[PDB]
Design a protein around this ligand. Structure first.
Ligand code: NA
Ligand code: NA
Lengths: 225, 225
């Protein structure tokens, strides 16, 4: 089918949400290279700053699976979905009972430009007052490998995530995402997407945050050594 | 420190367990190449055959993390632990509420030979009568990437697993393992172990099953494309 993805594409986003009842609004602008699976975004907290929780819990909601280097042999559910786009829904379950849900509706900017528009909602509850999220003791998310599999004509992606904590040790979170193209696209076989996402720059209270992600799809380890 | 691992090592195992109250005993003999991360095992059900449940649920308990190609830059918790050895404990939680727990105590054969002895216990409950486990509708486990991280001076490994089902679709299971060396060893930083395990031969009722696994450790996707 016909793809409208180009090598250099812009990003605009707006996230509205609440974590333990604390409301916030964050906007962002960036750019990426969909075929190389790399992207950058500059974020600004416009309401609710200074955030009382670890900024790291929000970052995977900001940096869209269109920014993944998919090899020719693996069906690319994401790049096929444009210009109409796709949406995603995710649950992020932390080992201490804290839980976040997020959604993103990803479409093209109405002016016809090479720009993805992201409408994000983010909500979190049951974070303990003395946990690493509320005490802001996280350093970064480790790299990860998301497992992609078709279910009910849509694509699911599950990933074991871990936040490295200040002073050592990790804080685990299980992600379950459901991706839904806005038109019929070819469905992929079971596959993997390796990710490496990091905050590359931030101000003291995380009102200004710069994010970078590199992601690449694969079919796992071949049986022969 | 001093490693006693050699390029060709033998395997002997005995699993005793129960799934939905059905008791069974299975023994196995095999061989592997620890540095190449590949191994084979020939299994025989000696009690409880024909098994009424999918043989696939047992296979990751049989095909020992010593059979992983660890690069020099990543600390190998497993190879350091010998000759004393190590044990593991695992929970395997299926999306339909079925759950299995397994343990393996891994030591060297008492005759001084280059042979790993595995004492395995396996227990499963709450599998629905019409699910793919009790109806034996599984095809294989997909390849996977296990996430390794230190916790309380021991090593944990978590992995999103999926059984491909007869007729298509996947049946998800979350593994949580805790590995415990029988002596002080150097602890690794956060890392990954890709696995690809498959039944290469079996008889009609799975009383005789041949298993092969290839596993290789890594540190995830580098940030630069
Ligand atoms: Na070989
Ligand atoms: Na680059």
């Amino acid at each position: 089918m016909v793809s409208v993805i180009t090598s250099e594409m812009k990003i605009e986003l707006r996230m509205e949400g609440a974590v333990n009842g604390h409301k916030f609004v964050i906007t962002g602008k960036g750019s990426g290279q969909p075929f190389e699976g790399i992207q950058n975004v500059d974020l600004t907290v416009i309401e609710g700053g200074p955030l009382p929780f670890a900024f790291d819990i929000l970052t995977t909601a900001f940096x869209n699976r269109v920014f993944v280097e998919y090899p020719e042999e693996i069906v690319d559910y994401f790049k096929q979905s444009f210009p109409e786009g796709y949406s995603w829904e995710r649950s992020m379950s932390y080992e201490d009972g804290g839980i976040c849900l997020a959604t993103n509706n990803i479409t093209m900017k109405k002016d016809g430009s090479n720009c993805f528009v992201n409408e994000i909602r983010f909500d979190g509850v049951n974070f303990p007052a003395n946990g690493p999220v509320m005490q802001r003791k996280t350093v970064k998310w480790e790299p990860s490998t998301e497992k992609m599999y078709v279910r009910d004509g849509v694509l699911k992606g599950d990933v074991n995530m871990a936040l490295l904590l200040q002073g050592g040790g990790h804080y685990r979170c299980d992600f379950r995402t459901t991706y839904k193209a806005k038109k019929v696209v070819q469905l992929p076989d079971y596959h993997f997407v390796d990710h490496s996402m990091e905050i590359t720059s931030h101000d003291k209270d995380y009102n200004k945050v710069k994010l970078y992600e590199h992601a690449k799809a694969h079919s796992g380890l071949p049986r022969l050594a």
